[PDB]
Design a protein around this ligand. Structure first.
Ligand code: BMA
Ligand code: BMA
Ligand code: BMA
Ligand code: BMA
Lengths: 418, 417, 416, 416
């Protein structure tokens, strides 16, 4: 069965994408974007998070490029929010969480600042007259506090006043740095952004993960030595789970293929390890995490021997798996990847898609029934673009640049025989 | 006005197709696919029919090839049903009807086995790893019990244990054999299937129908002699109506054009009678059955002088008419066929389409008001692909193969030359 | 940001178009098309208006050409209606308004007859076997009573019997004559239709509007001299507002560019003033009417110095502005026009589109909140095709002909 | 076998088209275009003929629209020529033939003036700044002297001073009037040219030819009564052959289908007889004139019982047959027309194409061997566009307009 690069499948994806764009519109709050619950209501107690606001700015940049009325107003809202309450006008950068009445979390989180970077870079592709100013400012914050020239890797977090950095180094924030750096590169061609991306991946993936059967180590000390037992007593942490989180492995895989494609796009032969390691991560994710416990789905985390720990099926791991299947199919022409993509789509409509309340469920238990454990509500639509829009685009340039360039369905041009 | 081979019209068709796919999803039951009612609910008392289950397997094969998440799971469900409760594990083939408790109708119905053949052949086009095995098994059953080598025609039915065949021969079962054989040909490229289809059409249409003003005779004895009086006392029978059923005539017309196109595809000149007789069937259907009684719509049945008998407007006849209009337009380029297609679409949205309760009504009275008489519920969506998907495809290969091949919209200043 | 001539934007446009076609279907009544309210219900007390019936005939002609089942039945219904109760079978032409009991308004309104002409011409593009007959008759009525050979302009209205014409000449009726004449030209090529359209535009726009900073004068006496203070006492009139109605200025702009494109289509160099004056009208509209009073949106009317009078934001002016932005973008390649189009789409979804009850609101107050003041319900869908379908087509031939020709998306990018 | 609307066939067509364009370029002379011989040199003794200069103006208009460097210079050359020595500044219109020291044939030939009209209308499609002026003037001459309002038909010829008209009416000149009128229509979108074309075809074809087994009568007296024995003593005349000339019958067929398509293009139902009679003419041409005498090819003339008179195979009849086969295929979708087109292409390359000396031979004997009898030289490339370019275009608008519109290969399969 052929779905990739078919207009019939791609029309289905677009129509679902519009349903998703509609869901996120409910998140608009004066200081940015709020946290949506299971019925698409704002959970006011959660306030305005930096990472959510930046993600929505990115999402509505893509929607704007797709020619959807109202989306550009959300881009504008996003850019205003990044210049408003979220912005620390004393020490620079952005607070982690604010609301109409003040700052709740003033800390300076690297993970969230890389999303700020992605949001600004994607906003630039819309031509919004204030987007490039925002990007330039974000670059200054990143280079001052979050890219380490000494370590040639990303730092994790600081206090409000940028006086003390966290005694921890994280694969997760570094992963989203790679993601953001790809798009910054697409809207600058300052070579350093791609160089930095390759460097980060070489350390986290080609060195550490590859040497552990492609089980990505996320937690390191300040000297970049793995802390294997980090969070052993808080294993279901939302951002720093104990052990391996296979959803991240497979996401890394796709990011490495965007890097491969960006190198190809400047007529450079990419290093072979990008594709090799992307295959490795994909294979490892299925090996350990797909249906390991008597029911379909991807578990949330595994121990260092591949045994599941948190068995809940969170939404984003399978969504990322679908994106990576597409990226691997694109580079390999191997139908096995398409078969996995299809299998996962069937699972998604069966268990995760929520036509009744809107969007998709965020989390299921080990029997694939809606649960509340790891998460609380439906606060994200950003990951969904990776299974809804990415499969309609080349791998270079990246998501927002490629949509703005008019590349949707560009490759959808007798597929049962040769 | 141009609709055929326009992306605007074809987009509308696709959007309606998705509405129809959605309606059929609630038919899923442990033993296969159940019988949906007017509001999309399962009518439990009807059980799990072989023909319905096989048709759904076919429909969701097309949906799967169209890239709809969930459709492949329904293909898988259908294949499991065909390997499970519906399959006669003792004597082979498939029971006509089952439920959770056991067998409701143990008979071995040719009509329904030809749908099993279609369903398996369409499933093959999805690449499902169990589909070819199913097709192989279905072919074995068909050649053992339902294609007669001596008659060079299809048998009608057997009892559960295949001890004796029915003393009756049917144009209806044979029509759906042609339909299935076309698709088996597409997934085998073995001319024997097309040889058989052409042979069947040559007897029922080119001989008997053509010599009867294109009024197709459906009921025959075992020597393939017409029984003109069959079911006089049960005229509104769902599968064996008394007299002629014009919806069937026009359906035969399309099938003959698929056959024509299949021959052309391998650079063989089709016999001229396929097109000639398709024209005759289409014309005769309009002649006897279109608006014959002071209101629009196709009547269900007519006597041998063309006079209406059962005057209800059932859904499938007009749907088939629309499919045949497309096929004839494709072969002739004659705009009259497109005009009919358009007129029929307008009728369908006015009277048949049911946006309130789902799908389309199954049956209307002679004033085009919803009724319950010949039928009971909304158990079919298979026919609707003939007015929704067929117009988006060439005539060769057939429906499911062509969608799998990526041919949707391939043919799409058209107000002048 | 690129939207014009992109399949992603055009798909969004088509899907909204279908939503709009669905809303109008509820307007069917035995005598034509009735007046839809905010819920898509018929407002029976409004009866069956000639202008509404003719507009719906036009709208469903386009829907039919787009391959929508049922639309042709609505064309058929409109044609029957134009041969039924609405037709004055005694004196000729069509009554302004009828109902199931008889004639409500027997007068013969030029404005509404030009819509009859448009409807018939659009219907011809469907091939409906009674459409050409309707067009031919409509042309006869227009040439007898509405196109003046002595004035080389359109007359305004008459009594039922066509015995006395109104002592008034109108820019508004003449504008919609231009619109109708373009489509009659498309389905005939009697040159006179384009000649007449150019003549009308040359008087109302090139002479009078251009000389008044592109503020179109609508109200004239029988000698075609402006009546500047017409309807001072009734400034929010639905068809003859006091002063300038900027939505009409921008509508004139687009029509002139359809005229331009028609001339190009036959390998003729169009007169330069069509584009020059389209630019002038567009600019003047932004200058006087866009967000002139501390909130977004187009006001309804302005005085002769460009100051707002009626500040309500009616639906059709912004819808027409979007159409004209597309036309100007097409001719100039200047992205400022695309930027305006996008800005206005954002405003429309924010304030005008009504996904709850259907269609779009007809009218908002000066703070962009839905109101009832100038208008009453949701009786029109015709204008919406100018921001939904027009951006998917070339400028020649016109709307219904172009859709019938299969030209949707024919023209459908961050660097050179 | 499928050729029509295939890119592979159309590429072959374009490549031959370029070889043909190249051959014509040597015809440039100071006063217009000269008469090319068998090896592509100028037959200087023939001087500059109006019909040749006008045809070359048309051909290079098409070449220019196709983006061939040098072609526009020839369009400019042709326009200058039509304003130079060929132009009668005293009495108006154009002399039939001039040379570098004066007028050779001062007569005012209708046949040649309809080609002047075609050449000007085609030149307008290139946007050359002097082309519209030329067309406008040519129209004035045609309407003064060559279209008769009284007869509703075209006259044949006049003396230099337009004092007396020839006591003769010709189906040939009228055929080329139809041809020219189609293109004038295309660059004016004005009804009257099509009305005139339809009227002309209705008389020559629907009345006279249809009632004589589709054998077109060409020679008429001043009352439009046939002269059946005209040119009995000069049967092989180049423009007025005795009896019927089947090449002309099949050419009429295509022109009627361009007429049909033009009507369709403005959403008008064309009269059924255009297609009926086009089929009739095509069939009759094969019936009487295709391989009638034991070898392939179309004879030049037949008598009124269909028997061949002049048996030479001149180039243009089969070239026109091929164009008509395309037009009939386009309207009917009947493969028999494509089969004939293919058969004729095979004959053309076997016997007519001249890769050695350039272009195609003008004339063969009854055994398909190159001969000199009816004609002398290779002065024409105009007909060749009817088998080289026409099969790559829709039937409306006509040749030069369609190429200028970007329509080449727009329509470009073993089963249904
Ligand atoms: O959407 C939130 C999730 O995003 C993924 O890419 C990872 O960064 C996870 O750690 C995180 O919980
Ligand atoms: O959908 C069921 C119908 O299918 C048609 O093709 C015919 O076989 C009818 O006899 C039958 O009732
Ligand atoms: O839709 C109704 C409106 O149409 C516009 O084009 C103008 O004619 C207005 O005066 C009128 O109120
Ligand atoms: O090319 C010259 C020829 O052109 C044809 O169309 C006819 O007019 C002939 O009579 C003429 O000899």
């Amino acid at each position: 069965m052929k779905w990739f690069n078919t207009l019939s499948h791609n029309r289905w994806l677009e129509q679902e994408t519009d349903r998703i764009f509609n869901f996120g519109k409910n998140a608009v709050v004066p200081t940015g974007f709020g946290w949506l619950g299971n019925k698409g209501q704002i959970k006011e107690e959660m306030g305005t998070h930096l990472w959510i606001t930046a993600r929505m700015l990115h999402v509505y940049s893509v929607a704007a490029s797709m020619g959807r009325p109202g989306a550009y107003d959300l881009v504008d809202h996003g850019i205003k929010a990044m210049n408003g309450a979220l912005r620390d006008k004393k020490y620079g950068g952005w607070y982690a969480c604010v609301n109409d009445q003040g700052v709740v979390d003033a800390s300076k989180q690297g993970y969230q600042h890389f999303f700020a970077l992605l949001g600004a870079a994607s906003a630039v592709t819309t031509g919004h007259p204030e987007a490039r100013k925002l990007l330039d400012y974000t670059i200054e914050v990143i280079e001052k506090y979050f890219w380490s020239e000494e370590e040639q890797m990303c730092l994790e977090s600081w206090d409000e006043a940028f006086s003390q950095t966290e005694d921890y180094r994280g694969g997760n924030a570094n992963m989203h740095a790679v993601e953001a750096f790809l798009i910054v590169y697409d809207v600058t061609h300052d070579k350093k952004w791609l160089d930095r991306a390759l460097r980060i991946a070489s350390v986290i993936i080609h060195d550490v993960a590859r040497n552990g059967d492609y089980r990505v180590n996320e937690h390191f000390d300040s000297q970049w030595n793995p802390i294997r037992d980090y969070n052993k007593d808080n294993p279901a942490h939302r951002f720093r789970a104990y052990g391996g989180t296979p959803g991240a492995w497979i996401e890394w895989g796709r990011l490495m293929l965007h890097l491969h494609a960006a190198l190809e796009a400047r007529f450079e032969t990419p290093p072979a390890w990008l594709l090799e390691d992307a295959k490795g991560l994909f294979h490892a994710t299925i090996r350990d995490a797909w249906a390991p416990d008597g029911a379909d789905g991807f578990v949330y985390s595994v121990d260092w021997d591949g045994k599941p720990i948190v068995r809940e099926r969170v939404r984003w791991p399978i969504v990322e798996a679908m994106g990576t299947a597409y990226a691997l199919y694109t580079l390999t022409d191997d139908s096995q990847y398409e078969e996995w993509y299809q299998k996962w789509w069937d699972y998604c409509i069966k268990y995760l898609m929520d036509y009744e309340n809107g969007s998709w469920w965020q989390e299921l238990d080990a029997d694939n029934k809606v649960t509340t454990k790891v998460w609380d509500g439906k606060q994200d639509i950003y990951h969904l673009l990776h299974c809804l829009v990415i499969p309609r685009l080349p791998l270079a340039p990246g998501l927002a640049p490629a949509v703005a360039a008019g590349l949707l369905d560009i490759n959808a041009k007798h597929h049962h025989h040769h």
